[PDB]
Structure formats: C-alpha cells, structure tokens
Amino acid sequence: GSYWPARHSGARVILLVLYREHLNPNGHHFLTKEELLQRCAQKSPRVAPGSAPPWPALRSLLHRNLVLRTHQPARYSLTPEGLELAQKLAESEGLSLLNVGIG
C-alpha cells in the first residue's frame, strides 16, 4: 500500500517473524530479541551463521507503531500496520512459517 520494505530486509524479516508467533495463542503473541535471532534461521536457509543483518531497526519500527516494545526483555509485538504488512510478507513465504514440515 504505502510502506513496503525490501526482500528479506531487516524491517520485513522482523514483522513477518513476529507475525507467526503472534498467531500463536498458546505461544505468546511476541518474542524476545534473543528468540527472534533463532527464528530468522528458518526465515531463510541461505542465511549464514556468521551473518546477522541490521536488526536494531526494529526499534525504529516501534516508532512507526508497527511493532511493540515491552518490559525489557522488550517483548516485540505486531500492531495493526505490522499485522497487515506481515500478512503480505507471509504470502511470499507461502505463509508456511509458523507451521513447517517440508523435507
């Protein structure tokens, strides 16, 4: 619509990754910065172990009201905008993030 990050970019990978866990009622609608890094591992295989793209960007997203910071452990959560966009970013992944079993 208006704001559309790049492919597998920082702001994109984060809102989308928060999305799946957000769709998890029995798994908390959020994730810690430490858990996110683990999530990205599935976000894309090509990703390398010694490769950590700029993630602090999420902080700036809190300002755009796409993400939500918490108590610190700063739990991050998808807001209305982050949710909408995330659903879109999910289309690209076939939306098989939360539930995966290919192999």
Automatic annotation (TrEMBL):
Subcellular location(s) of the protein: Nucleus, Nucleolus
Source species: Homo sapiens
Protein's name according to its UniProt entry: Crossover junction endonuclease MUS81
Lineage of the organism: Eukaryota, Metazoa, Chordata, Craniata, Vertebrata
Family to which the UniProt record says this protein belongs: Belongs to the XPF family.
Span of the entire protein shown here: 128 to 230 of 551
Oligomer status and interactors: Part of the heterodimeric DNA structure-specific endonuclease complex MUS81-EME1. Part of the heterodimeric DNA structure-specific endonuclease complex MUS81-EME2. Interacts with BLM; may stimulate the endonuclease activity of MUS81. Interacts with SLX4/BTBD12; this interaction is direct and links the MUS81-EME1 complex to SLX4, which may coordinate the action of the structure-specific endonuclease during DNA repair. Interacts with DCLRE1B/Apollo. Interacts with RECQL5; this interaction stimulates mitotic DNA synthesis. Interacts with CHEK2. Interacts with EME1.
Function, in words: Interacts with EME1 to form a DNA structure-specific endonuclease with substrate preference for branched DNA structures with a 5'-end at the branch nick. Typical substrates include 3'-flap structures, D-loops, replication forks and nicked Holliday junctions. May be required in mitosis for the processing of stalled or collapsed replication fork intermediates. May be required in meiosis for the repair of meiosis-specific double strand breaks subsequent to single-end invasion (SEI).
